[PDB]
Amino acid sequence: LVPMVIEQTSRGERSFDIYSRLLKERVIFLTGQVEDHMANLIVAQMLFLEAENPEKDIYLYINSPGGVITAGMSIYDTMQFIKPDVSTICMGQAASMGAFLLTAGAKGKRFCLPNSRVMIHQPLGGYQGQATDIEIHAREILKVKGRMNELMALHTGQSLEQIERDTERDRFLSAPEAVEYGLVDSILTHR
Amino acid sequence: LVPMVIEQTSRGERSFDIYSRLLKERVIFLTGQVEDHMANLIVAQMLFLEAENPEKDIYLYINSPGGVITAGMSIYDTMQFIKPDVSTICMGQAASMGAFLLTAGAKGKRFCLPNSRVMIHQPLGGYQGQATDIEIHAREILKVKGRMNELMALHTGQSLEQIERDTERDRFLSAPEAVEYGLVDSILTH
Amino acid sequence: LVPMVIEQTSRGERSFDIYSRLLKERVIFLTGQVEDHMANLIVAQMLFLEAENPEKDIYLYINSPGGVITAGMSIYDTMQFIKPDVSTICMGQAASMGAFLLTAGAKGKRFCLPNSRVMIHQPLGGYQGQATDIEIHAREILKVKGRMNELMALHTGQSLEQIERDTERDRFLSAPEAVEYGLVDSILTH
Amino acid sequence: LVPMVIEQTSRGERSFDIYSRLLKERVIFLTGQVEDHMANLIVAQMLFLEAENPEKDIYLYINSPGGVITAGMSIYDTMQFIKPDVSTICMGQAASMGAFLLTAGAKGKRFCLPNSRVMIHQPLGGYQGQATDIEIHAREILKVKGRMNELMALHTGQSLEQIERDTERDRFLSAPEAVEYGLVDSILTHR
Amino acid sequence: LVPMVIEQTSRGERSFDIYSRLLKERVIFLTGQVEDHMANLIVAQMLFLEAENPEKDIYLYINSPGGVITAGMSIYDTMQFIKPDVSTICMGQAASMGAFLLTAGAKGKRFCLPNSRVMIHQPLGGYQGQATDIEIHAREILKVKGRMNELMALHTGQSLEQIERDTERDRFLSAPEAVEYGLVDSILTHR
Amino acid sequence: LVPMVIEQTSRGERSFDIYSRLLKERVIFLTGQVEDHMANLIVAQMLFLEAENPEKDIYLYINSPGGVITAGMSIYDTMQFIKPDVSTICMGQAASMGAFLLTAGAKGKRFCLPNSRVMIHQPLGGYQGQATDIEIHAREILKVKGRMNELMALHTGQSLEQIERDTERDRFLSAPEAVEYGLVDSILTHR
Amino acid sequence: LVPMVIEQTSRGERSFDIYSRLLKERVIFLTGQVEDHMANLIVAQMLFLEAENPEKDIYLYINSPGGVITAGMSIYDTMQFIKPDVSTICMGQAASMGAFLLTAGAKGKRFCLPNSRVMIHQPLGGYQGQATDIEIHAREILKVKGRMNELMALHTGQSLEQIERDTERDRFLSAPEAVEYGLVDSILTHR
Amino acid sequence: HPDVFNILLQVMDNGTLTDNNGRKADFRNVVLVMTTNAGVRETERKSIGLIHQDNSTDAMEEIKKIFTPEFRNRLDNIIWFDHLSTDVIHQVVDKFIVELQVQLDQKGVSLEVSQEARNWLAEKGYDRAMGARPMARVIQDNLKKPLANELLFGSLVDGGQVTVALDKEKNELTYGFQS
């Protein structure tokens, strides 16, 4: 289970969860498959940190294999909406949605550990029904793909054409390669 | 797990969950498929906030992909007969019931995010058995179907013909399209 | 996860759940299929509120889709027995047993939201085995049907003939139509 | 979920769960199928209340649909052993075992709501094995029925022959019929 | 759900679970199928009460339908080891292991309610594999069978031939006949 | 549910669960199949006790049916590493890696109850795949077997040949028989 | 159930779970199959300890059968990044990504217990789809394979070719053999 | 702290106070006045949400919760304020200028300030959250800094004849001394 930790506050000793203690230091953890509930929890954490000190910059660690895109967009819009820069430090693994949030971090603050692995892929979805119903759902998936590619280009800085051809099939970009592609500014070796 | 946060109250530091603190600031979170259970939690938050200060306004975030009509309808009726204007914000996605609760907020207070994707379609359900029961069940879904389009037209302001024709089949409306459709305005980032 | 709400007291701040805080305001919630354990919980809340203030009227919301009839009687008998007048507020779907609780509410204090759905139907049950055993169970369900129909006419005021006809087959009634049938006094103004 | 409740005490406010709050008032709740675990909790409550005031009567609400007969004996024997008279109130319905515990209350303290139901039927059990083993089990279940009919007759006041005929097959007794049959003294309407 | 109870000690007011409160009064509850973890809990409660007051006598309420044999011996070994007399009460039912623990109580302190039931059966187990492995395991059950009969004879006081003869097949014993058999000392109807 | 107990101290009253109270007295319960998770709890408890008193003797109540051999070695290594003499007691059954930890106790402190049964057998494991991989995994189990025989020989004192022939097949050893073999020094019936 | 251990300080006595108490002593536990969630706790623990005392060394007990490759890299990247030297102890078992973290420890502060065993093999994975996708996914396994050997060769100090051939198939290395291989500096017989 | 409030209850009802020294004091003729600053803190407090929500709280609401009703029962009357006026704040500049000008009279100095400048300076200093607390500091800062340098040696030593007026483009007061 989660291990309790002690903070030597001036008033007195207090017991906090390991995640809660780190949250007080503007540190959020994105762990596991992306989902509405976990993402909503991250959104709540961001708003709490914003009110405490909007001048300070939030930190976020992306170690996830990806998931639902709808929930992930709530974090993307929230990251840009809030004034604090949401630093992104990919640890271990990043997926299409995880990498999308990794690039969403403020310029100059995105990071990726040396042995971290990033992957980007086109949105995957399916629908079953009448031929007409398949068409409308297909349009949204294509629109999401187009919109996501446009957003990636803005943060990454690569041309839309380059991202589209690269994102058509799974592309595994290591941490050094990510800097070249532009997903991340630099690797985290010294603060 | 829900992280605990410390609030510097005048008496002293108080440790409670993250959602509870946001609930203290009149922030209600609607997430996941709507059901009779989570509906009461949302309604309970609205009733409690109303008693504390009915003059202030309540906020509601929508990140649901659908849900039951009866469960979601309970929140709609709650937001109507209460003085606090319940602001509605779409986070990630909306659906038939999510959008209904999104457009149910007070005119002007309802907002939406830029990359949010909304969807609205008629309720889908079915009943099997003797022909008599299917007739009564089928006639009921038609009556309630018109009610959703009727109430939706009141908030949006569009003609019922547009809503029923559009709602007959799934219609994905992005943030700019929603503004043109008249369902909700855009978030004031500034 | 149910959220917690801080309470203001002169001695010191206290923390209670959203449901528990509402109980302090004489608000009892009902949701989900009626069950023996769920019913005893509502009964416990009614008894506790009665001792606190036997004069102050109680409020009981209903959003259940129906359940076992036996457990529902425990709630009905308690409501009639307790001196406080329960204000039944139909916030959502109300099935045969769910609707029965609304009628049990004290006259003049029953309420139903405008978009709420209240459907009534005869008790549904079955048994399989020897013919002799089936006869006992068959007679019992018919007797129970009479009791529910008889008590329905007491609160609603309609004749037994009328109650028998509407309840013989599945019937779906809207909120305004309920006032005509006498199931509910009137919809909430605000 | 169990809602909490607050009580006022001289030194400070006391917070108790709804079920425990009723325990202070000698109000026990018997809900659900009878079992060795839930029954152990019921007898535990009975013994606790006896020490507090061995004169004040206990109130055991009955809304159970029936259960194992072994666990019922623990509650029945406990009720008779303790000095305080146990008041049995039938809420909703009382099956064979629930009815047995219902009628087991002290004379004058047995009640049934006007809309409650009461079902009674011979014990139900089955043993699959060799003929020699089935012989022992068949005798035991019959002996158990003998012990229940004799005790039901004592509390109800009906003859053993009458109970045997009525208990041979399932029978549902309404609230008024229970008073005539002798299961309870009267309906709970005034006090 | 577990109801809370108030003790109101001289030092102050304390709150304990119903089971924990009874444990303070030396009342231990044995319920459900015997198992290593539940038996470990019972052994822990016996050791704790031993150090609190070894002069006093411990009480055990048995309402178990039988379970693992090895777990039961752990409880039995701790009853004879500790100086306090572990009184045993049969609430509802006692199976082979439940009865072995019931009769294991000190002389003059074993009781059973009038409507209680008892059952004694030979150990049952099975093994599958090579014939050689079955031979070793077969002797183990027979050695254990002799061990249970040897210990039951000491507590009950009957001849080893009678215990094995009667325990060959499932035998049910009511409350009064059990006292004649030596399993229980006397009924707890009144003192 | 686990009961709670009150520890009387001059400073005040402390509430502890039944298991934690026993841990204060250097009593550790090894119950259930050996696993990596449960072993850490036993290992963490041993290390905590060493700091509190690195000279007092620790006690371990072994009532397990055996399990993962490698996880058990984590407990065996810690037993000999820490300066305290880890006394071992056998409650109920003891099997492969349960008995190995029972005999790993310090000389003169290993004990067994009169009815406690010990079982010893060679490690059982299986792997399927390529023939080359099977040879590698097969050689490991054979090497581990020798380590088990070598380690048991030191504690028991018997030659490897005796243990090797006896451990080939399952061997059940009662408390008196186990003492002769050398697993435990004596019984706890009278001390 | 994790037990609660009392810690005495000049300010007062604070009750902490067994794992939290050891965390206060810079003792992290890596138990079970490696995963993103359990790795997040290990990563979070290292950061907290580093801040409390960046000079003091951190100990990471390792009893794991292996797991996800990417999740472990988060832990590995955090060990080299922080200033504290992360000592590693192999209790019971170490496998792929469990042993990699063992050798990843600071030089001169890596140990293995005398009866511990460690295994190493190449990453195991698979994918199903079109041949084009299988090519890129397959190429990634080789990239991590080559990268993993480069890190192991760096810590162990052995030639890259030696690890490549050895890693190809499973190799079970005992504690003394690990020292010769270079995974650990010595055996932890005592400090 | 709550104990501090407890002492207040004694004087309101008993009208006497007992301490360790044991000296008795007379509270028959004493008057008591209090000030509540909790309302000001909540006005500037940020809201944890996507969009900040206006909180036009009233003075009455704070005392209901922060203070026990027992104190309100003994309390005779409670007063409330919102803001003085827009014009009065302009007048506040004039009132300070009166005392500031009185200071110049001692030095035999004359100074004039533009009516428009006086209004803008009042608005700059006055704030809703801080009220008139910083107004005093800004008044002196506008003229004390420049005047100080030249008062030692200059026209200010004899008559002053100072002229003060703001600049439209720079919104900065200009100082000219004509003796």
Q: Using only C-alpha atoms, what is the Rg of chain C?
A: 18
CB contact burial E45-60 (16+ within 10 A = b; e otherwise): bbbbbbeeeeeebbbb
Positive or negative, the CA dihedral F42, F44, F47, F48 is: negative
The answer to whether the Cβ–Cβ distance between D133 and E21 falls below 8 Å is: no
Which of E2, E44, E70 is closest, CB to CB, to F92? E70
Is residue F93 within 8 Å of F119, Cβ to Cβ? Answer: yes
Side chain identity at residue D92, one-letter code: G
CA atoms within 13 A on the CB side of H40: 12
User: What's the Cα-to-Cα distance from F58 to each of A88, C1, F107, rounded to whole Å?
Assistant: 49, 42, 13
Report chain D's terminal Cα–Cα distance, integer Å: 32
Secondary structure E strands in G81-151: 86-90, 93-94, 110-112, 117-120
Q: Do chains D and B touch (3 or more CB pairs under 8 A)?
A: no
**Coil, helix or strand at residue B110:** coil
SS3 at position G53: coil
| Neighbour count for residue G128 (Cβ, 10 Å) | 7
Residues H68, C8: C-beta atoms closer than 8 Å: no
| Resolution to one decimal, Å | 3.3
Residue of B nearest to C3 (CA): B20
Contact C135, C151 (CB under 8 A): no
Residue A153 backbone zone (phi > 0: left; psi -120 to 50: alpha; other: beta): alpha
- D95 token code pair: 């099956």
In the numeric block, which tokens belong to residue G91?
Answer: 């209790």
Cα gap C167→C160, rounded to integer Å: 10
Is residue F88 a contact partner of residue F46, using CB atoms and an 8 Å limit? Answer: no
CA atoms B32, B35, B38, B42: torsion sign: positive
Of H48, H55, H66, the CB nearest to B22: H48
Which residues, other chains included, contact D163 with Cβ-Cβ below 8 Å and sequence gap of 6+?
Answer: D149, D152, D153, D156
- Beta-carbon contacts of E17 under 8 Å, excluding residues fewer than 6 positions away, are E2, E3, E4, E5, F1, F3, F4
Instruction: Give residue for tokens 């605990």.
Output: B4
Strands G58-63 and G27-31: parallel
Separation in Å, CA of C5 to nearest CA in chain B: 7
Amino acid (one-letter) located at D34 = V
Return the number of other C-beta atoms located less than 10 Å from residue H159's C-beta: 14
Determine contact: E53 vs chain F, CB below 8 A: no
- Rounded to whole angstroms, the Cα distance separating F125 from H150 reads 99
Q: Which residue(s) pair with B14 in the sheet?
A: B7
**Among candidate residues D69, D60, D59, the one with its CA nearest the CA of residue D35:** D69
**Distance separating alpha carbons of residues E109 and E122, to the nearest angstrom:** 26
| SS (HEC) of chain E | CCCEEECCCCCCCCEEEHHHHHHHCCEEEEECCCCHHHHHHHHHHHHHHHHHCCCCCEEEEEECCCCCHHHHHHHHHHHHHCCCCEEEEECCEECHHHHHHHHCCCCCCEEECCCCEEEECCCCCCCCCCHHHHHHHHHHHHHHHHHHHHHHHHHHCCCHHHHHHHCCCCEEEEHHHHHHHCCCCEECCCC
SS3 category, C15 = strand
Q: Which residues touch B150 (CB under 8 Å, ≥6 apart)?
A: B160
The subunits that touch chain G, with at least 3 C-beta pairs less than 8 Å apart, are A, F
Token readout for D83 is: 């000095």
Note whether C143 contacts D: Cβ–Cβ < 8 A.
yes
Q: Which of B149, D92, B135 is nearest to C39 (CA)?
A: D92
Which positions ≥6 away from F8 have C-beta within 8 Å? Answer: none
C36, D65: Cβ pair inside 8 Å?
yes
The order of strands in the sheet holding H159-165 is H109-113, H159-165, H174-177
Is residue E8 exposed (0-12), middle (13-18) or buried (19+ Cβ within 10 Å)?
A: exposed
Q: Do F133 and G170 touch (CB under 8 A)?
A: yes
Q: Does A189 contact G at CB distance below 8 Å?
A: yes
- Under 8 Å CB-to-CB from D180, ≥6 apart: which residues? none
**Helix G69-81 and helix G131-156: axis angle, to 10°?**
40
Residues of C with CB under 8 A from a CB of H: 8, 10
Put simply, whether E47 touches D (Cβ < 8 Å) is: no
Q: Distance (Å, rounded) from C-alpha G106 to C-alpha G87?
A: 6
State residue G93 phi and psi, 5-degree precision. -155, 150
Q: Give the CA radius of gyration of chain H.
A: 24
**Residue F9, phi-psi category: left (phi > 0), alpha (psi -120 to 50), beta (remainder):** beta
Q: Please report the residues numbered 26 through 45 in chain E whose beta carbons come closer than 8 angstroms to any beta carbon of chain F.
A: 36-37, 39-41, 43-45
| Amino acid in the structure at residue E53 | N
Task: Enumerate the residues of chain C whose CB falls inside 8 A of the CB of residue D124.
Answer: none
Going through D105-190 in order, the beta strands assigned E by DSSP cover 110-112, 117-120, 171-174, 186-187
**Residue H47 in contact with partner chain A when CB distance is under 8 A:** yes
Cα G100 from Cα G152, distance rounded (Å): 7
For residues G48 and F28, give the distance between their C-alpha atoms in angstroms, rounded to a whole number. 30
The Cα–Cα gap between D104 and D75 comes to 10
In angstroms, the Cα distances linking D84 to D53, D78, G157 are: 8, 11, 81
Residues E41, E35: Cα–Cα separation, whole Å:
10
User: Partners of H110 in the beta sheet?
Assistant: none
> Chain F interface, mutation test: which of E40, E52, E79, most F Cβ atoms within 10 Å?
E40
Which structure tokens are listed for G126? 């698979």
> How many Å is the Cα radius of gyration of chain G?
18
Closest CA to E43 of E13, E68, E73, E2: E73
Contact B59 H50 (CB under 8 A): yes
Please give the backbone phi and psi of residue A46, each rounded to the nearest 5 degrees, phi first: -65, -45
Q: Of C19, C74, C151, which has the smallest distance from its Cβ to D91's Cβ?
A: C74
Q: In b/e form, how buried is each residue of B44-78, taking b as 16+ CB within 10 angstroms?
A: bbbbbbbeeeeebbbbbbbbbbbbbbbbbbbbbbb
Contact C8 H70 (CB under 8 A): no
Instruction: Say if residues B32 and A35 touch (Cβ distance below 8 Å).
Output: no
- Say if D9 is an interface residue toward chain C (CB within 8 Å): no
- H61 — contact with chain C (CB < 8 Å)? no
Enter the DSSP assignment of C85.
P
Contact A21 G48 (CB under 8 A): yes
What type of residue is H131?
Answer: G
Q: How many CB atoms lie within 10 A of CB F145?
A: 16
SS3 assignment, position D93: strand
- CA D114 – CA D91 distance, rounded (Å): 10
Burial of H94-119, coded b for 16+ CB within 10 Å and e otherwise, reads eebbeebeeebeeeebbbebeeebbb
Separation of alpha carbons D13 and D15, rounded Å = 7
At residue D57, what are phi and psi to the nearest 5 degrees? Answer: -80, 145
Inter-chain CB proximity A139 and B172 less than 8 Å: yes
Q: What CA–CA distance (Å, rounded) separates E7 from H172?
A: 77
- CA dist E49 and E54 (Å) reads 7
Separation CA B75–CA A119 (nearest Å): 41
Chains H vs B: touching, with 3+ CB pairs under 8 Å?
yes
Q: Say how far apart CA F148 and CA F143 lie, in whole Å.
A: 9
- What tokens were used for B59? 């906020």
The whole-angstrom separation of Cα H179 and Cα H111 is 10
Spatial distance between the Cα atoms of F139 and A27, rounded to a whole number of angstroms: 48
Q: What is the rounded distance in angstroms from the CA atom of residue C44 to the CA atom of residue C115?
A: 30
Tell me how far apart the alpha carbons of residues G54 and G86 are, in angstroms, rounded to a whole number: 11
Cross-chain CB nearest to C31 (options B17, B40, B83): B40
Neighboring chain C residues of D92 at a CB cutoff of 8 Å: 36, 39, 70-74
Chain B residues in contact with A37 (beta carbon < 8 A): 31-32
Q: Give the strand pairing for F86-90 and F111-112.
A: parallel
Beta strands in A9-92 (DSSP E): 13-17, 27-31, 58-63, 86-90
Check CB contact under 8 Å for B74 and C64.
Answer: no
F70–G contact, CB cutoff 8 A: yes
Nearest to H150 by CA among H123, H175, H115, H130: H175
Question: Is A167 at the interface with chain G, CB within 8 A?
Answer: no
Angle at C163 between CA C158 and CA C164, to 5 degrees: 145
Which residues on neighbouring strands pair with residue B174, listed in sequence order?
A: B117
Strand partners, C88: C60
Query: What angle is formed at CA E140 by the lines to CA E135 and CA E142, rounded to 5 degrees?
Result: 95
Report CA-CA distances (Å) from C90 to C36, C69, D38.
Answer: 21, 18, 34
State yes or no: chains C and F have 3 or more CB pairs below 8 A.
no
Catalytic residue among B96, B116, B155, B186: B96
What is the longest distance spanned by two Cα atoms in chain F?
Answer: 68
C36-52 and C69-81 helices cross at what angle (nearest 10)?
A: 10
- Which residues in chain B have their CB less than 8 angstroms from residue H68's CB? none
Alpha-carbon distance B106 to G6, whole Å?
Answer: 55
Subunits adjacent to chain H (3 or more Cβ pairs under 8 Å):
A, B, C
Residue F108 CB burial class (10 angstroms; 0-12, 13-18, ≥19) = exposed
Q: Residue D48 in 3-state DSSP?
A: helix
Chain F interface mutation, best of E43, E83, E128, E144, highest count of F Cβ atoms under 10 Å? E43
The token duo for E76 is 């039995």
Backbone φ/ψ region at F182: left (φ over 0), alpha (ψ -120 to 50), beta:
left
Nearest chain F residue to G25 by CA distance is F48
Task: Give the integer Cα–Cα distance in Å for C88 and C28.
Answer: 10
Q: Are G13 and A12 in contact (CB under 8 A)?
A: no
Handedness of CA H56, H60, H64, H65 (dihedral sign): positive
Give the minimum alpha-carbon distance from B116 to chain A in angstroms, rounded to a whole number.
7
**By the 8 A CB rule, do D28 and D42 touch?**
yes
- E92–D74 CB contact, under 8 Å: yes
Residues A127 and A189 sit within 8 Å (Cβ to Cβ)? no
Experimental method: cryo-EM
Q: CB H46 to CB A47 under 8 A?
A: no
Question: One-letter amino acid identity for G12?
Answer: G
Q: Using CB atoms, pick whichever of F18, F31, F113 lies closest to residue E48.
A: F18
The Cα A101–Cα A183 span in angstroms is 10
Q: What is the DSSP string of H48-110?
A: SSSS-------HHHHHHHHS-HHHHHH-----------HHHHHHHHHHHHHHHHHHHHHHTEE
Q: What's the gap in Å between the CA of F139 and the closest CA on chain G? A: 9
Closest CA–CA distance from residue B84 to any residue of chain C (Å): 12
Contact G116, G86 (CB under 8 A): no
CA distance H112 to H162: 6
**How many Cα atoms occupy the beta-carbon half-sphere of E78 within 13 Å?**
24
Say if residues C62 and C86 touch (Cβ distance below 8 Å).
no
Interface of B with A in 83-142 (CB under 8 A): 91-93, 113-117
Tell me the residue type at D2.
V
Quote the distance between the C-alpha of residue D35 and its chain's center: 12
From chain H, pick out residues whose CB is under 8 angstroms from the CB of C7: none
Segment B16-21 long-range contacts (CB within 8 Å, at least 24 positions apart): B16/C4, B16/C6, B16/C15, B17/C1, B17/C3, B17/C4, B18/A41, B18/A44, B18/A45, B18/A48, B19/A44, B19/C1, B19/C3, B20/C3, B20/C4, B20/C5, B21/A48, B21/H48
Distance CA A19, CA D29 (A): 41
CA distance E85 to E105: 7
Return the number of other C-beta atoms located less than 10 Å from residue G170's C-beta. Answer: 19
C7 to chain H: nearest residue by CA? H65
Residue of H nearest to A54 (CA): H46
User: What one-letter code names the amino acid at G48?
Assistant: F
Identify the bridge partners of residue D50 per DSSP, sorted by sequence position.
none
Q: How far is CA E101 from the centre of its chain?
A: 2
Q: Which residue in G93, G63, G60 sits closest to G75, CA to CA? A: G60
Rg from Cα positions in chain F: 18
The number of C-alpha atoms within 13 Å of H114 and in the hemisphere containing its C-beta is: 15
Q: Where are the beta strands (DSSP E) in chain C?
A: 4-7, 14-17, 27-28, 58-62, 86-90, 111-112, 118-120, 171-173
With beta carbons under 8 A apart, name residues in chain C contacting D122. none
Who among A5, A61, A115 is closest to G76 (CB)?
Answer: A115
Q: What is the separation of C-alpha G55 from the centre of its chain, rounded to a whole number of angstroms?
A: 21
3-state class (DSSP) for residue D135: helix
In whole angstroms, what is the distance from residue A33 CA to residue A64 CA?
6
CA torsion sign for D183, D185, D188, D191 is negative
Q: What is the largest CA-CA distance in chain D?
A: 67
Helix (H, G, I), strand (E, B) or coil at D94: strand
Q: Which residue of B has its CA nearest to A71?
A: B92
**Tell me, what amino acid is at H26?**
D
In this structure, is the dihedral angle defined by the CA atoms of residues A107, A108, A112 and A118, taken in order, positive or negative? positive
How many Å apart are CA F122 and CA F170, to the nearest integer?
Answer: 8
E81 with F5: Cβ contact below 8 A: no
Q: How far apart are CA D170 and CA D120, in angstroms?
A: 6
Q: Is G186 on the interface with F (CB under 8 A)?
A: no
With b meaning 16 or more CB within 10 Å and e meaning fewer, what string describes D4-13?
A: bbbeeeeeee
